[PDB]
RNA sequence: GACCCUGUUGAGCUUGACUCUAGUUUGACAUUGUGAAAAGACAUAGGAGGUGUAGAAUAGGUGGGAGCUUCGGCGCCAGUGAAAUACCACUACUCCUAUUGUUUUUUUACUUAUUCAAUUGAAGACAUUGUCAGGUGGGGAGUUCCUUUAGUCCCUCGAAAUUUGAGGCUAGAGGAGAAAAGUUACCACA
């Protein structure tokens, strides 16, 4: 029965008692069963490639030249590089220090790639923590515009600061502010970026804390504060510019009340933004209901990223559109 | 509202829309009540309970969660009465709780007994809608039961729309009249406002 | 020798005052129009939907209600579900269509604005301009409250199928001034 899957489940893979009943919820049981293996499973590691100082191809022959064994991940990137052995460490390698190449996971690419930033264009990231996606921003638009990054932890911004100028960005200043204050400080922006803090559900081989230290209380705070996150960056953008930008929704997290509901709530409110196809080349479409409550049909065009589909973290990936 | 057209409506449910439909179901009536402006989302949620004292529906399946000095008076009454092994038994199996709570419509609890009740099945059978009602210290069963039902529990949901089941065939016109005006003055005393607030009546039946 | 200290130099760490403002910057509103072509939004009037899971199932939702009943199909029930199907009663979103319109943009031109040569030609509705509402301000002019913690779970703004979060209020403890200062079981030198 459901009752003794819910408790042989707890036991065995170690979860909270509520959050195995929330993940069971949203899938059918055969796939919650491949979906727990890959989760607490490791991921495969993944190069991005700097296309300033380099490229794809030359940078793989160095690295198999200094030993590393690599293969180019799939055809959605021309940019990624999967490794699978090393005899030097990577971030050894002198290719690492120029700033050839840097240590990224597969659900940093695709809001980028979600994203389409272009040249002399404003652009923005509410949460920069790594720095892996500023990077990457910074590559499409060839050293033009300008980034303004940005991470309420003075901590991180120590690696946000190491990672930019190692990588040769040149263009990108931080701020360590709040970011539902970002708005009121400059506005008008064309290509607002935002990785909210979240649950960590789509990520549990990096944060194993989530398997049990996540809650009721947890749950309703968390998604709380993506809303007033996401009415921000509608309250940040343009409605009209000389080329058209666009917001990126992206989280971390598998959940229902920090996906599928806060776009919910932010297309209620704000009626100037629409939802088109993300660009992403594949993925699954969002739940239209899940407990009782629609949702508008737009959410069909969002895609959700699964561990046990492809071997990447759990993700939501949404771009809007302002009118107005 | 007007009395005039409380009476139109009524000869035109009784015995207009009893000739037009010939009802082969229980006859009764029910008040749907919409409302303009007032976001259920916001604050200042009503959830208040109108005395009755008519009992419009008869067939009213009852039970009671009895301590000591109930079990002969219930018997007699034929009243379902549970000792403390059988609320034992029912908390052993949850599935069974339930299926029982859709049979019976209403609880009565004692005074001790709601303090036991909490322990483990107390917010399992809370995520009903179900709240069994206190006994005072009179303990007379009889017409207690009679004032404890028919008390119309006026709750806000999230939904713009409200209906309430009120009213027999088998009663005279005067009196379930004074149950329409009673239901809608307290209803409106609920509200945040007065008359304004509402937006429709529909005293229709079900039939 | 370790080890302690003094001075200089690096690595830091904590500061380096308040109010208007130069500068600089975001948003909004105007000169700044006239056509065409499109596109979009809402204004009404029609048509049709819907497959997360499980449930036999393309379950909007909601009020009741247990055969309303043409066949006893559908019912009832049983499951299965957050929500259950019969029956009547209500009204939501989306996508189309229409005209029963208000519009807003983009593109294309023109100059009817605006800017230069000139002192009639070009650019051209771009800039540019000004006013409000902001951000910053190591600069210019004067001038000499916040931090840590708890409660009112009281008030305001948010969020949640009824409980939270952020501000307000209250109370236990702290306080010659951009030229430069205190500190380190730290570094190099003497």
């Keep these: ?324 | 509202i007007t009395v005039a057209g409380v009476r139109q409506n009524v000869a035109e449910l009784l015995d207009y829309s009893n000739n037009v439909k010939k009802r082969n179901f229980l006859e009764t009536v029910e008040l749907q009540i919409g409302l303009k402006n007032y976001d259920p989302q916001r604050d200042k949620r009503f959830s208040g309970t109108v005395k009755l004292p008519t009992v419009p529906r008869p067939n009213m399946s009852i039970c009671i969660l009895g301590d000591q000095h109930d079990i002969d008076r219930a018997k007699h009454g034929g009243i379902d009465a549970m000792s403390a092994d059988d609320l034992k038994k029912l908390n052993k199996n949850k599935k069974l709780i339930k299926k029982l709570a859709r049979k019976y419509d209403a609880f009565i609890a004692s005074e001790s007994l709601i303090k036991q009740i909490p322990r483990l099945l107390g917010p399992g059978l809370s995520k009903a809608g179900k709240f069994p009602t206190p006994v005072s210290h009179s303990d007379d069963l009889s017409a207690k039961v009679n004032e404890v039902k028919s008390t119309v529990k006026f709750q806000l949901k999230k939904v713009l729309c409200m209906g309430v089941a009120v009213g027999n065939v088998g009663m005279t016109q005067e009196q379930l009249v004074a149950n329409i005006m009673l239901a809608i003055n307290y209803l409106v005393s609920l509200l945040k406002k007065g008359w304004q607030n509402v937006g429709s009546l529909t005293i229709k039946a079900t039939m």
């Design chain 1, 1 to 324: 029965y459901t009752n003794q899957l819910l408790k042989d489940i707890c036991a065995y893979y170690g979860y909270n008692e509520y959050l195995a009943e929330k993940l069971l919820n949203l899938f059918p049981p055969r796939e919650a069963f491949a979906f727990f293996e890959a989760n607490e499973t490791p991921r495969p590691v993944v190069i991005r490639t700097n296309t300033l100082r380099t490229h794809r191809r030359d940078l793989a022959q160095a690295l198999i030249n200094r030993g590393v064994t690599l293969e180019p991940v799939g055809k959605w990137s021309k940019v990624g590089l999967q490794v699978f052995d090393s005899k030097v460490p990577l971030g050894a390698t002198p290719e690492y220090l120029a700033g050839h190449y840097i240590l990224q996971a597969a659900s940093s690419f695709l809001p980028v790639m979600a994203l389409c930033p272009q040249e002399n264009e404003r652009c923005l990231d509410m949460a920069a923590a790594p720095g892996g996606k500023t990077t990457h921003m910074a590559a499409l638009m060839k050293n033009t515009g300008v980034i303004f990054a940005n991470d309420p932890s003075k901590s991180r911004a120590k690696g946000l600061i190491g990672n930019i100028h190692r990588l040769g960005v040149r263009n990108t200043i931080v701020c360590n502010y709040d970011a539902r204050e970002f708005p009121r400080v400059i506005g008008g922006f064309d290509r607002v970026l935002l990785d909210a803090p979240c649950s960590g559900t789509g990520v549990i081989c990096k944060d194993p804390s989530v398997k049990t230290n996540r809650d009721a209380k947890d749950f309703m705070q968390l998604p709380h504060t993506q809303k007033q996150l996401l009415l921000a960056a509608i309250d940040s953008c343009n409605h009209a510019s000389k080329t058209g930008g666009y917001i990126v929704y992206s989280t971390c997290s598998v959940c229902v009340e920090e996906n599928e509901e806060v776009v919910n709530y932010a297309l209620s409110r704000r009626p100037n933004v629409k939802l088109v196809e993300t660009g992403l080349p594949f993925g699954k479409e969002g739940f239209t209901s899940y407990m009782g409550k629609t949702f508008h049909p737009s959410l069909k065009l969002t895609r959700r990223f699964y561990p046990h589909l492809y071997n990447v973290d759990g993700f939501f990936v949404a771009k809007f559109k302002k009118i107005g």
